[PDB]
Amino acid sequence: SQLAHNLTLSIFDPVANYRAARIICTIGPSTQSVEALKGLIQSGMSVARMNFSHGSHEYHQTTINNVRQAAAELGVNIAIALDTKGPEIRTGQFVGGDAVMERGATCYVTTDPAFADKGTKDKFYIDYQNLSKVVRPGNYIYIDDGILILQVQSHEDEQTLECTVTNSHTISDRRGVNLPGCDVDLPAVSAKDRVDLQFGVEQGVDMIFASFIRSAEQVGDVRKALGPKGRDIMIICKIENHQGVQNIDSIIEESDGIMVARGDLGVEIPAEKVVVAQKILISKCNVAGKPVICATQMLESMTYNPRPTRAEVSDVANAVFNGADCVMLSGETAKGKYPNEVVQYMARICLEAQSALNEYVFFNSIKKLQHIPMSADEAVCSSAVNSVYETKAKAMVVLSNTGRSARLVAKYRPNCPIVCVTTRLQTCRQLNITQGVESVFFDADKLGHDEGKEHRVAAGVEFAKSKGYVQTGDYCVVIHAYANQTRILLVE
Amino acid sequence: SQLAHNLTLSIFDPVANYRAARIICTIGPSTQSVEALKGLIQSGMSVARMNFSHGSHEYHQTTINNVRQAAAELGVNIAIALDTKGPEIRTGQFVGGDAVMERGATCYVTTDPAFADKGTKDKFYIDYQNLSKVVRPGNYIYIDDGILILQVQSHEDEQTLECTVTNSHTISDRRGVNLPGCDVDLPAVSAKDRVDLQFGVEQGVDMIFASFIRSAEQVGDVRKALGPKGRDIMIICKIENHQGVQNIDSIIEESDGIMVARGDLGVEIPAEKVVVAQKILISKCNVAGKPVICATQMLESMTYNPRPTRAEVSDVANAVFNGADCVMLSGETAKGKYPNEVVQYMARICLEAQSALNEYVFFNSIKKLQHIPMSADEAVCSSAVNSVYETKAKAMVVLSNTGRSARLVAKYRPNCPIVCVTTRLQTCRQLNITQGVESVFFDADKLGHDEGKEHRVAAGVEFAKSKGYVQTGDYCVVIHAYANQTRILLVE
Amino acid sequence: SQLAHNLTLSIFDPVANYRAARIICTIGPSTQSVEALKGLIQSGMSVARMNFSHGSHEYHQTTINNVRQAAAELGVNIAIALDTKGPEIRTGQFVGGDAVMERGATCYVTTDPAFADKGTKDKFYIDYQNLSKVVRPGNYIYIDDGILILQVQSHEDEQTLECTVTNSHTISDRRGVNLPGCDVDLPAVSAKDRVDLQFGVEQGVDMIFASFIRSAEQVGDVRKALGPKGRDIMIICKIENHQGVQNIDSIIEESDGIMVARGDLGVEIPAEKVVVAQKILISKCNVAGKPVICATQMLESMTYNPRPTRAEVSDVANAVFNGADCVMLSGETAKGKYPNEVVQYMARICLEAQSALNEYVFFNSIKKLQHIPMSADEAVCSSAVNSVYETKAKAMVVLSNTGRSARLVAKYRPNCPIVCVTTRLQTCRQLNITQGVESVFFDADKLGHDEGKEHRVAAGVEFAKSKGYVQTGDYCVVIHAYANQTRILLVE
Amino acid sequence: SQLAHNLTLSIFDPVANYRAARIICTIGPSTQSVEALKGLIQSGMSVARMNFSHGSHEYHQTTINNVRQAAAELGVNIAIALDTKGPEIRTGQFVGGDAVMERGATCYVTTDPAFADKGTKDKFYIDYQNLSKVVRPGNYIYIDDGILILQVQSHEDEQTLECTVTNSHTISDRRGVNLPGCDVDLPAVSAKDRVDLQFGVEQGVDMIFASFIRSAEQVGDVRKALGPKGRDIMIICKIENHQGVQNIDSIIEESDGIMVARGDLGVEIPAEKVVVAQKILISKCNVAGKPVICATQMLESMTYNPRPTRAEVSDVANAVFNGADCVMLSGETAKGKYPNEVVQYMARICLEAQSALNEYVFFNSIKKLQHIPMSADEAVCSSAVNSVYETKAKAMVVLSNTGRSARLVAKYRPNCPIVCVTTRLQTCRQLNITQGVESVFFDADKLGHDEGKEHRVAAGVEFAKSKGYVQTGDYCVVIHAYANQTRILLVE
Ligand SMILES: O=S(=O)(O)c1cc(S(=O)(=O)O)c2ccc3c(S(=O)(=O)O)cc(S(=O)(=O)O)c4ccc1c2c43
Ligand SMILES: O=S(=O)(O)c1cc(S(=O)(=O)O)c2ccc3c(S(=O)(=O)O)cc(S(=O)(=O)O)c4ccc1c2c43
């Protein structure tokens, strides 16, 4: 019924009084200082991403420290995400640091370590030791962000493949390779990841963006790598190839959420199919009640230009229309010239799209897919959201300690803000990747367990009032316990 | 969707484990004793009806006292209803106590009091002083349960009408007359009614069955006759003629419920149209959320026969299918030979019909008619019933002091029993005219105020457990404070 | 959505301009003459039933001849139904022609032929030779329209059962017996049936009402008994016991329609369960697109009284509300005092009920149960009816040679008349048991095959105009070929 | 329910066997030759757009002639569109052909013709004579594709405005100006337009893309300029500013279709609001049943690059998801380096998006918005598309001479190809802007009138068979005469 909703819209009508979508910002030289982070927060950042593909632990410690300091000074809660380097397939080195590959020419790719240092255009090293047994004749080898394409002709020997160069491209040392038609059987985490994941646990990071997730089993490996002390850290699986896409159901099941890495997917998969995979992955996550992130190549041109392209704007809006919880910035904030302006524009685009989005369509579609009998939690949350639509309530208040009930309510897409009142600061931070929720910390050790729920509900209603969401005479739908209890509250 | 439900049914499946419909019994010489009343209660009586058309105040006092004693000995709460004699139009007396009226003959009906004692076949008295100004030429006068029909030809004078006798019938003294095409402007209540109603209040009757209600204004007159001390007494308007049917919407709005008096309606309205009138009135009350009673000619032949006719059985079942809260027995229990058996059989027909009735059709139809935005009470009660269907809950517990929210929940027709927990014994009695509800009395003077609701909630759950409605691991939907709070409870 | 429809009704609003339901009349002494049949036709008879339980072939030949003559003189088409005696279980004869059975007494029922002539209260004959092997201890034997009930205690021998008399009842010779808890394995047709069925084929009867149908296999036996020359005769299966009810799905599948014989069912099954079985059977037939007849005990009291009871009126109306194509009269027309008046009242009741009935509920419920993909026929007919509702067309015209397409359209319950134009007179007659259809004969041998369909469509539109169904500017939905072609026609 | 559909998708499933969306290509020096036009057609061009902002009548004559020759050699019918230059507001000339405008500086814009040749940075000419009376103080003047922004301070005199230069930009002679907050009251069409439009009619163009449409009245002006001989030519209104968006409802009603000119809209409206405007306009046209074109900035970077950006790809796909009939290429085909490749890639994106698009959502949404009662044409066309879904038909055949009914069927979005059989070659060409339709020309002069429709029906079925849409035993939904007749045909 989005079509019917479109008919009634006017672009000169006022936007909504809240932005549901959440913005993730990659931190770098442009943004690591406390003042720059404060600018980012004020601009609309909810999550600070650390890209562990670059920088040392000391560098990322500065990010961690500065984020917390910036957040404390503004009196907000900012999530900290550790995005892993992950397993990689790279070529070796070349003689003269270069190799001119030409269309029609024959070359030999080998997994023999002896050729790691002495590669040429004729024969060179690829560090993936299972390359030969995974590839068949006819398969393609992509090298250097998929620019150079090789086609496998035959097995020259156990370690060496005879290849045709399908297009002219010059490659340098240690370039990344992709196997578009092959199942890559590299482990879930690299040696570097294990060290980085333990550091993340020690430093109290909120979530892991786990690279190159290909199967459900690998999610559990990441979990093992985090250890017992890292059990409450969210694992967001980055979907980067056909295996991740094909195994999406079982991966979603095990994960705490999904990143749609469009650029990485686009190395192996045609761009038009990636648009569609984005649609599928987001909708599957919406149904699972798990956060989903739209990432890479969002407003890329705004890295060095003061404005992005028109197509980039439509990309951001359509991620929201698709149902994304979050939209992500990489180089635009990490190394960009206009970090504040890009985040501010991203927020503006999201808000505009949201105002056009018919939330009821999401609620109705998701409700109709539920199997009857529903469990108590599911019934309470869907009914609560239904009560919002039926009474035209102007806010929801959800008491949630772990964040579970808040995510379950957000899943059903009410057309008003959700205020989550929680007794855990880490819940405040982790809910920053869930659309349409804002969190209020209730310090139970300071103020009491509030067994009758009245103090926490009042904290919720008050926050909603301070934001202008509700006033005297408005309805507010309250849910508390997982979640098995609902009230329709008249605001005083 | 009753059609689809019919397809899945088997008459060899076991009946439901509860009966939703309620049975009202008229008390008389067959049934006035404490033992006969106990037999009635055990047989399925929820409401004792006193017909104030017959008997003295002392006689009805004995009914009141004996009902209370029988109910107390069985540990149940039974409603007491006062059915008013109502205003009446009667003929006067005749010379020789008889008048042979013949087809084709001319007679004269007069409102002159002089002819009250000396009526003949040629000229006789009718005590309705507004008869002449209300009737036009061509209108019919029905006399003696509509058996004798006269047609008005002209005004002989200000007090006398010239009539044709349309059919041969012999009438005796003081026979009741009907004016099928005329608006009868008799007061809402007679002097006897006003006297009887004050007696009702003194004796603490639960409800009035107010005879011959024709307009909304008239409901006010009953309320005023009940006075400040009778404010909590329900007024059930008896719809007996075309006027009550025409004015049904406004009457319902002012009343606490409706009785469809098929027999009386049938005097002036063709029987097939009364069947449809029954459908309309019941549905309107179902939507209004107010009790509706199907009464007169229910299992009439079982007054003196050990079994009813097959058509009588279908009549009762279809009353239930129509949506009636209550079915009513008159002579069958008042002066009948098989009072226990007729009630037991009525209960069995009702239970059978219910097992074939698709409650969801009622729920959905009524829900769809609700105006959006809904008020909090309406939204909470429909949502709670919806949750029953979604979780396949096996009971509802409703905390309701006045019975209001119990009736609001019952309106939406869950497919499980409703247990009302109330602090007022009169609420327990009054809810006996609401289908699908059983009341549990919680003695606040003896047990406390239960401000946390936990004791009353547990009492409700316990009652449901003792009746075998719920066991360990079943869901129970709990609703309480109007009612703005809901819980989905897992039964321990 | 019948409930929603009830809210908008007024009993003082005009009835519909057509009666959809069809009336079947049993012919007898009261009605066999041509003039009485003409009276019956003019009163509302569409089908003349011949009860072959009584009367000789010569008697029924007079019925057949007189029906055709009466129909020809009024210029209408009247269906002729042969209702078979069917297989029966009877007791033998008694010494003195009588047997006084008393509660508590022991008696012996035997299948030994020697006791056929010499029965007593102690020991008597039952002609069902499989009685002993079909009955277990504890089972009941009903005798004399189920008035006398015996309980089987043990097998006295291979042919004799020891029985307790559960109630006092005096029985005479050759009384009918019932086995409520037993599968009766008597053949589908009796010896008498075979002779009667062949006579029916020779005389060109339109349909058989086949008695005591218990299983799907038996329908085929009736078909075999009709022979190759009787292949177009409709077999309507009379459902009279639990076996018929339990096997209803497979029976409907094989049959051309169903009679719900309430009185016969009521011998073995409690009356309240028969009400429900009526609901189930009718809805299952509505879904199968096969005619269903509500029969026995319809307005029985109008056999000798000038008016029926109020409950009888509600029974007739509720048969229509249930979805019956037809309602049937037995003794009311066969031997009754008021044959014309009873048929006229039956028509009036049906028309009143129909005016209150929400046809869209039937259409919608039936459409939603269709499996997708639908076949072409199903899609065309449902769409055609949908087009009636969407354009508010005032009539349908269906060209059907066998009647198949007309029944398929009628199944979907448009809220306007269906005019079937057919090239077969027998189709005109057979459609008289399908609700909401009227037939126009088009003599193709006289007027041409009308390959372009224009003459037949014009015949349809003209008939609709002559009845006042459509006028200039109204829409008419036309369907022709089974049926794969639709037109929405503007009436000139 | 796009959400539910997304769940069932796999990007590794094969794409649909037809492309519904249509590709419009702008002709220029890269593409004007018969061979280049043939390459365009084979690549996926359905419509040749002539941009009358550039080139002479002789130049466009050559485009017209070459299009017809290329189409004839490939045996296809290609639409020819004349896109008007439209009315324009331009600045005058400058001394030295240049003017350096600086932030903070004051300048004077004048409508006095004397300054047309002698403009400077201080004072210069704007050819819109109503400039002063249309603009208020505070309004902005955009110049040179909205790069230079001026703010009006006051009226210096009747012809001169005092302006602040809000940003530094250097402008040259005759630059286009925009008035974002002002209603431009220029005539619908310029003198050139009126001349060009008469040329269009003489040369038999299929459609006009009318520039800068701001009101419904203006559509009339285009129609009048086309004259009596241009009555069958479609007018597609180009929505380019806030006025066209505001007045969209009345514009749609008067026009034959809409072009959403994102680039032009973007000069005065923020890009994120243009994305939403696109959603609104497309949905409104989908409901109106009129063609809608998504145009400007489609795959722009592919003008000089061999591949587009990832965001450009998503832009195209989302145009299709929005519901666009057509996507349009401008410079990419007019003067681009990869004209064949850009069209081929556009076709591939469109086909991919379509395979993910749930057509049923469109069908249902549009059907639900229809007013009941419906007219015959609307009812027949929605019902035919409904029948496609119900029978899972694999093609539709629509007989449509003017194309009206073809467009009406396409409006309801069946999930199979539509084959229009038409007797007019201009209908074949005009339907090229309607998604999901392929036209078959039936030469009535050479083949007959086909009064029975059988030849045209067979031609439609045959075409569908040759394209592999249907084979033996598939269903095909046939619709013809407006269109009031429907057939569900089993393919032989
Ligand atoms: O390869 S090493 O760098 O020596 C290395 C070191 C450590 S550490 O001692 O705990 O740091 C590992 C811990 C746990 C591992 C698990 S598991 O999730 O714990 O089951 C699985 C695999 S496997 O590659 O999938 O077989 C491991 C491979 C290599 C590992 C470790 C693995
Ligand atoms: O018992 S009889 O009266 O001698 C007698 C006479 C004839 S007749 O010669 O055709 O008139 C029969 C014709 C067809 C019969 C069929 S069937 O449908 O044709 O298969 C079945 C059974 S059965 O009882 O189910 O086994 C029959 C039983 C008795 C029959 C006939 C049966």
The residue whose two tokens read 């602090």 is: B423
Question: C358 to chain B, minimum CA–CA distance in Å?
Answer: 12
Q: Which one of A263, A276, A353 has the shortest CB-CB distance to D9?
A: A276
The residues, any chain, with a CB within 8 Å of residue C63's CB and separated by 6 or more, are C27, C32, C48, C50
The DSSP symbol for A431 reads G
Q: How much distance in Å is there from the Cα of C220 to the middle of ligand 2?
A: 13
What radius of gyration, in Å, describes the C-alpha atoms of chain C?
24
Rounded-to-10 torsion of CA D353, D356, D360, D361: -80
A90 is catalytic: yes
Final resolution, Å: 2.1
- CA–chain centroid gap for D24, Å, is 8
Kindly determine whether residue B379 and residue A488, on different chains, have CB atoms separated by under 8 Å.
Answer: yes
Q: How much distance in Å is there from the Cα of C50 to the middle of ligand 1?
A: 90
Residue B84 labeled ligand binder: yes
Where residue C436 falls (left for φ over 0; alpha for ψ -120 to 50; beta otherwise) is: left
The residues, any chain, with a CB within 8 Å of residue C113's CB and separated by 6 or more, are C125
Ligand 1 nearest-atom number relative to CA A194: 11
Q: Which CATH superfamily is domain B1-18+354-491 in?
A: Pyruvate kinase, C-terminal domain (3.40.1380.20)
Q: Which one of A276, A353, A362 has the shortest CB-CB distance to D11?
A: A276
Which one is catalytic: B49, B175, B194, B394? B49
Q: Do B and A touch, counting CB pairs below 8 Å (3 needed)? A: yes
**CA dist., res. D118 & res. B293, Å (int):** 95
3-state secondary structure of A298: coil
Q: Which one of C283, C315, C356 has the shortest CB-CB distance to B276?
A: C356
Residue A28 labeled ligand binder: no
Mutation to probe ligand 1, out of A129, A186, A215, A221 (largest number of atoms < 8 A from CB): A221
Q: What one-character-per-residue DSSP string does A182-231 give?
A: S-----SS-HHHHHHHHHHHHTT-SEEEETT--SHHHHHHHHHHH-GGGT
Angle between helices A376-391 and B376-391 (to 10 degrees): 150
Q: Which one of A376, A382, A475 has the shortest CB-CB distance to B475?
A: A376
C-D contacts (CB, under 8 Å): 70
Name the CATH topology of A87-187: M1 Pyruvate Kinase; Domain 3 (2.40.33)
Chains contacting A with at least 3 CB pairs below 8 Å?
Answer: B, D
The DSSP symbol for C278 reads H
**CA dist., res. A306 & res. A340, Å (int):** 11
**Cis, peptide link before residue A306, omega less than 30° from 0:** no
Please answer whether residues C282 and C324 qualify as being in contact, where contact means their C-beta atoms are separated by less than 8 angstroms.
yes
Rounded-to-10 torsion of CA B173, B178, B182, B184: 70
Domain D19-86+188-353: CATH architecture, name and number where available: Alpha-Beta Barrel (3.20)
Q: How much distance in Å is there from the Cα of C193 to the middle of ligand 2?
A: 11
Pairing mode, strands A292-295 and A257-261: parallel
Residue B209 burial (C-beta neighbours within 10 Å; 0-12, 13-18, 19+): buried
**CA dist., res. C423 & res. C443, Å (int):** 6
Residue B264 labeled ligand binder: yes
**CA dist., res. A321 & res. D283, Å (int):** 15
Question: D413 to chain C, minimum CA–CA distance in Å?
Answer: 17
**CA dist., res. B387 & res. B371, Å (int):** 20
Ligand 2 nearest-atom number relative to CA C191: 3
Helix (H) or strand (E) holding D478, with range, is strand D475-480
The residues, any chain, with a CB within 8 Å of residue A252's CB and separated by 6 or more, are A258, A284, A285, A288, A290
Chain A residues in contact with D312 (beta carbon < 8 A): 311
Which residue's alpha carbon is at the smallest distance from atom 5 of ligand 2? C191
Q: How much distance in Å is there from the Cα of C449 to the middle of ligand 2?
A: 42
Closest Cα to residue D477, out of D461, D488, D491, D490? Answer: D488
Q: How many residues does chain D have?
A: 492
| A224 CB near ligand 1 (under 6 Å) | yes
Q: Where are the domains of chain C?
A: 1-18+354-491, 19-86+188-353, 87-187
Kindly determine whether residue B374 and residue A390, on different chains, have CB atoms separated by under 8 Å.
Answer: yes
Buried b (16+ CB within 10 A) or exposed e, C411-445: bbbbbbbbbbbbbbebbbbbbbbbbbbbbbbbeee
Chains contacting D with at least 3 CB pairs below 8 Å?
Answer: A, C
Pairing mode, strands A437-441 and C98-101: unpaired
Residue C263 labeled ligand binder: yes
Chain A residues in contact with D368 (beta carbon < 8 A): 4
What radius of gyration, in Å, describes the C-alpha atoms of chain D?
24
What separation, in Å, do the N-terminal and C-terminal C-alpha atoms of chain B show?
35
For B376-472, list the strands marked E by DSSP. 395-399, 418-422, 437-441
3-state secondary structure D79-111: EEEEECCCCCCEECCECCCEEEECCCCEEEEEC
Chain A residues in contact with D277 (beta carbon < 8 A): 11
Closest Cα to residue C387, out of C292, C248, C489, C319? Answer: C489
| A377 CB near ligand 1 (under 6 Å) | no
Residue A156 CB neighbours (<10 A):
15
Q: How much distance in Å is there from the Cα of A255 to the middle of ligand 1?
A: 20
Closest Cα to residue B458, out of B478, B482, B473? Answer: B478
The residue whose two tokens read 């009408």 is: B161
Residue D480 labeled ligand binder: no
The residues, any chain, with a CB within 8 Å of residue A424's CB and separated by 6 or more, are A401, A402, A403, A441
B296 is catalytic: yes
Which residue's alpha carbon is at the smallest distance from atom 25 of ligand 1? A187
**CA dist., res. B118 & res. C305, Å (int):** 35
Which residue's alpha carbon is at the smallest distance from atom 4 of ligand 2? C191
**CA dist., res. D15 & res. D5, Å (int):** 15
Please answer whether residues D465 and D489 qualify as being in contact, where contact means their C-beta atoms are separated by less than 8 angstroms.
no
Output B467-473 pairs: Cβ under 8 A, ≥24 positions apart: B467/B17, B467/B18, B467/B417, B467/B438, B468/B17, B469/B17, B469/B18, B469/B394, B469/B395, B469/B416, B469/B417, B469/B419, B470/B394, B470/B395
Q: How much distance in Å is there from the Cα of C27 to the middle of ligand 2?
A: 30
B404 is catalytic: no
Kindly determine whether residue D279 and residue A9, on different chains, have CB atoms separated by under 8 Å.
Answer: yes
Helix (H) or strand (E) holding D272, with range, is helix D271-288
Please answer whether residues D379 and C391 qualify as being in contact, where contact means their C-beta atoms are separated by less than 8 angstroms.
yes
The residue whose two tokens read 């590839």 is: A135
Kindly determine whether residue B376 and residue A391, on different chains, have CB atoms separated by under 8 Å.
Answer: yes
Chain A residues in contact with D245 (beta carbon < 8 A): 11
Kindly determine whether residue B484 and residue A484, on different chains, have CB atoms separated by under 8 Å.
Answer: no
Largest CA distance in chain C: 80
Q: Which residues line ligand 2 (CB under 6 A)?
A: C 187, 191, 194, 221, 224
